[PDB]
Amino acid sequence: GHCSDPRFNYDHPEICGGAAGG
Incomplete structure (x- = not known):
């Protein structure tokens, strides 16, 4: 999913x- 986000x-x-x- 929004796995491109360091926080996520x-x-x-x-x-x-x-x-x-994901």
Whole structure:
């Protein structure tokens, strides 16, 4: 999803997991 965001990755590590496609 919005994994391109530096905050979003930290804010929601479970949603992104390890891919920008989240």
